[PDB]
Symmetry: D2
Subunit: 340 residues, 4 copies
């Protein structure tokens, strides 16, 4: 019955061509985004920006199954006085909560990271459940170059921490989003799509091996991986190649028991993220749903149009709704260049 509840939550998050808004940027990460448009990163600006997204009615009702939140935001109220989690729920979306405390340097493995956040997590999860969160998220950052990175050590240690995080979540009634990101836009980003395929394959294999050993219910989780794609500074793979290779790697490494895969955008352009997802959804019947869990690819246009100003709310919401809808169509395999 815990299993049944988790299964139902996971299915709702990937159901009916809908997908996840990744709005869970930590203070430093959102500060970086805000700084790129010359906006000051205050708490009120963060609230106002998020409120603008979460009251974007069309997108929130028709396209967004869930929203991943950062801790601050989960506890924040709208200007109207209503809890932001309650706005999210009034649109028929499920609130979720990012619980990792960041990717930190891994001792003895230079240029690689290990994600922290397991300490006190049982207790944080119970609190988050009480506040209405029904899923969680943890991000593992996997560095990549032509040959030396990533190491098996870094992969295994990150997969082990993901498994620990995932078992705890399920124990508290929350569906874990498991995010192992092979970086397309890291410090080294000239790798080929072939190199990304071989690394992603080993990463997903190890991730699922560790989830298995830690007794994680595959039916009650969601995978949020990178697509198989070349590095940002060496992009030559076509939309078709990206889609074909991505789905090929998933067939090999993601058990059919997993109900959905919601991709990260990872540095891709807005249109790329949509085109790639759409082409994967026209490759014939798949054992899991393929959808989006996009941060940048859902937000970057909204953020630029917003520009920190109240008078830009509507025009910001339009950009967000438009990208939400294109990605909805992508989740249905129905997107075309013409619809942009």
């Amino acid at each position: 019955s815990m299993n049944e509840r988790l299964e139902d939550i996971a299915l709702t998050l990937v159901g009916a061509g809908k997908g996840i808004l990744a709005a869970d940027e930590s203070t430093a990460t959102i500060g970086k985004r805000f700084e790129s448009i010359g906006v000051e990163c205050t708490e009120d600006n963060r609230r106002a920006y998020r409120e603008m997204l979460f009251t974007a009615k069309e997108a929130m009702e028709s396209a967004i199954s869930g929203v991943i939140l950062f801790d601050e935001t989960l506890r924040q109220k709208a200007s109207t006085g209503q809890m932001l989690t309650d706005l999210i729920r009034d649109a028929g979306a499920v609130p979720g909560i990012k619980v990792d405390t960041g990717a930190k340097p891994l001792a003895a493995f230079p240029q690689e990271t290990i994600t922290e956040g397991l300490d006190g997590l049982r207790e944080r999860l119970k609190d988050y459940y009480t506040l209405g969160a029904r899923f969680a998220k943890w991000r593992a950052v996997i560095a990549i170059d032509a040959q030396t990175l990533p190491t098996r050590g870094a992969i295994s240690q990150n997969a082990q921490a993901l498994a620990r995080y995932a078992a705890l979540c399920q124990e508290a009634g929350l569906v874990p989003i498991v995010e192992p990101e092979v970086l397309m836009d890291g410090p080294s980003r000239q790798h080929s799509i072939t190199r990304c395929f071989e690394v992603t394959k080993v990463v997903l294999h190890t991730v699922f091996k560790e989830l298995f050993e830690a007794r994680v219910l595959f039916e009650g989780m969601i995978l949020k991986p990178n697509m198989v794609i070349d590095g940002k500074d060496a992009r030559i793979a076509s939309v078709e190649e990206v889609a074909e290779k991505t789905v090929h790697v998933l067939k090999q490494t993601v058990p059919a028991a997993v109900p959905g895969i919601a991709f990260l955008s990872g540095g891709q352009t807005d249109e790329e993220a949509t085109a790639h997802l759409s082409a994967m959804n026209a490759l014939g019947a798949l054992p899991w749903k393929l959808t989006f869990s996009y941060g940048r690819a859902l937000q970057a246009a909204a953020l630029k149009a917003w520009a920190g100003k109240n008078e830009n709310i509507v025009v910001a919401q339009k950009a967000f709704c438009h990208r939400a809808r294109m990605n909805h169509l992508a989740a249905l395999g129905q997107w075309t260049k013409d619809q942009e």
Copy 2:
């Protein structure tokens, strides 16, 4: 590259169009045991007659059987009409294959468990078998089971490791390998529950695929031949529906979608159980792989009884084989009923 693509094509043919595999690969000792039960002397010539009878059941072979697993001897044997037995198989649109393991032997330091031998010289044997018309291969790992101590992690991993060594060799030779890790329902202990079989099978398939992965086996170019999740032969209480459900469940958790097909062993189930179970699994809606059969006993026991070692009974024994072939053909399509007989 092109060769990988070819391995997929062969693998897909073996599990496509509601067809399945005839497991006719009994070793000398094994087929001898099956002959002794019906009072027929186990000689080369009787083994040749028996198998020729199966392969000349035209309608069964043409319409139901995609491939035949053969033992070394049979692959090199002539039919009484002068052609190779493999010619008959190919004339019926079926693909010949070859069992390459040398039997499940006792595993040092693991009492009551076995390890399968046959890797020595396997590269050269595979090359020879390909020139003899074999396009796929087979290796059985035998996994013991009881309530709590068997099977050990060690016995499973060592078997999984030999299976992977085998699979990589087959694929390099151009043969699709059938990977057969059987958790015994009919072993020395056989009063275990279906929940126990579920858990054991889960760890076996997990470890098998972990080792296939590490040995760089192409999942798209192989076939799995597992037991179904079933209670022990002497404590059968689980329903058809529960066997179907729990089997499909464990496979969705452990068998990658890249694998084109799963062809079940009958394992000591009755003819009708094996058929019903397969049909009820294909009635559960859409799945990531094909579900079909690779049955020995469940395709053969009845025909062998009707044959009874006598040339006069070729017609009748063929009838009884044609029937089972057709029933399991319907099961593969999810169209079997007890009514179809």
Copy 3:
């Protein structure tokens, strides 16, 4: 060179027949110990009790290479105004810091635990180094019973956390004590010495495998294991058998590169813990130093004599000094029962 420094500190911690006072009890644990002798667990009483131990100059100067501390104590002043760690350093002992945050229930593994503490551990270690700590400690708790506990999953996950801890300690300039305790005094305490042998074997093997994968420098760490011993409520093994079996499991699992092994007392009586260590050091040349890292076995008698009373300070110091000396003798293989009198 920073590798060479870790080696030096580790060697110092197990050298010259000296050993480690394990005084790192967390608030709840030291509370339980004070409650037994009817003493209120206040910050002041904890300070008073630790100050009594650290001012027992005879024992601290002769027997104690190092002191494992809890966070609070590392930051505490003596009644005389020095830092408590000044007293420890003056006696020639090295201060150390326990850095784990406790053994919590492990999701999906009923009745087993996982140790927390890795979050922010880099920054804590850095800060702890500036407070004078030159080694650290982390405890994995491994439950045990006749057949089901511990699970391989619980050991693996606990070994993996240990390895993460150890790599961080060495990066920060501190020697990690790696403490995987198979409990003799948990809920199940009627298990055999054979059962402990088999479980400790798997625990230590798994621990050193994970340390190896996480690039831990074996030459710059200390192991603090349980001795191989039957459960507390089913004690049959003689002194010789415990010593022999313990050394045997260590020769099988603990690399020669490790400089010292400092045992936990684990529920054994004060005399048992002394006698077992002495017997182990009377077995001839070994590839690592064998000494003590005792809590109860160095403190139980001193605590009882102290009885939360300033007037009992001298008598408590004498009790501690005696047990320190006996254990000093054990570390040299020179203890006999005569010398308790």
Copy 4:
């Protein structure tokens, strides 16, 4: 008692400054050696050559604890009509048998190998025991270059084959020599001593991990590794550095429970091989015996001097006796350059 006998055999093989004569070269391998000095590789020349070694009284009695034999040689008679195994036993040396069937290309791992010979091994071992063999040998060949080779896969599969062999040996009552050789003299051989150090470390770690899992008794086996040394065409490591790094990697990876380590010479010169072993034994107390299992380093000079002629038996036996003695002194840490005179 099985354990106790394996242990005793193992101890004898590394005891008292003695070491193993590796004379188990297969037909193809001995043919390469013979062709080098212009001698036809016939069965009679192989018999005559080995007879010459095994009747070198002084060398066989004082330096050689055991002789590894190829199958053919184990079944061969001397010119006098006596079994060669009896000649070996009459000098106080124990006969042993190499049981692998060669290092073959590993499917899906270009430029790497996997060693065959597990099939029918239980039966071969039982026959070898009856014939007087009391230990066995199996060689895994690990390719090496600057970055890409060896792969984890190749190491794992070879370690797993090694463990299967070792378990079977012990069951039949033979002590398995476990030989995992990182090549200094394969296709690529300009790798540095640091690179060899890292590769050898992962190899030895993986080997012992798999032996552990396969329930191999550490106390009843012998390791035969390469020394830690740079490639043949990039030799810069001093004698002292090789000795030091070799002993370092062994303390990291080879359990104290293992009674002995007997190095392969691996393409080193005769003198290097002796000097390195001697330096290693001058580094103070070690947890295991360190000695030799030399093929080329004990024979090259004898073979050259023999030159395929009966006329040179004495001059060949003299050159073999001198190397046997130089290596005996090395096993004792007593070799010097001056003793070559």
